[PDB]
Design a binder for this molecule. Structure first.
Ligand SMILES: Cc1cc2nc3c(=O)[nH]c(=O)nc-3n(C[C@H](O)[C@H](O)[C@H](O)COP(=O)(O)O)c2cc1C
Length: 122
């Protein structure tokens, strides 16, 4: 995991799951800037049609300190909908307390026959 490779955000469980850090990929993906992200909650990416039950699964997972993944619909700054494969993982300290969550986002795109050929024979 690198911040100049990958797309993720870090939430502070001690400051109410406010985002404390976002990677470059996240700003590129969503088109939002730091002023729209840092200190906020990523639920701002949700919008019309976002699945309520998936969002409830995310909420329950965070409440429980559990790892999680799920596809949900999100919205870029210009209002473009995209499918977000969101992976959540808790971060604990020494004591085994959840102090942060990391969230890793993948904008769904078509996986092609070409990419598959590449994958099995790099
Ligand atoms: C580290 C982290 C990253 C998150 N990233 C996203 C995201 O990219 N898109 C999204 O819709 N929700 C994301 N969420 C979920 C929202 O922050 C929120 O937890 C979710 O909408 C359910 O809670 P709510 O019902 O109070 O909104 C993320 C949560 C955490 C903790």
């Amino acid at each position: 995991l690198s911040t100049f490779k990958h797309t993720f955000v870090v939430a502070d469980a001690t400051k109410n799951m406010a985002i404390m850090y976002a990677s470059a990929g996240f700003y590129e993906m969503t088109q939002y800037g730091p002023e729209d992200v840092i200190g906020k909650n990523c639920r701002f990416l949700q919008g019309p049609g976002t699945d309520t039950e998936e969002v409830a699964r995310i909420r329950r997972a965070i409440k429980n300190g559990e790892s999680h993944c799920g596809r949900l619909l999100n919205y870029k700054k210009d209002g473009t909908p995209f499918w977000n494969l969101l992976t959540l993982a808790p971060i604990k300290n020494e004591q085994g307390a959840v102090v942060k969550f990391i969230g890793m986002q993948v904008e769904v795109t078509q996986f092609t026959e070409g990419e598959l050929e590449k994958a099995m024979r790099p």
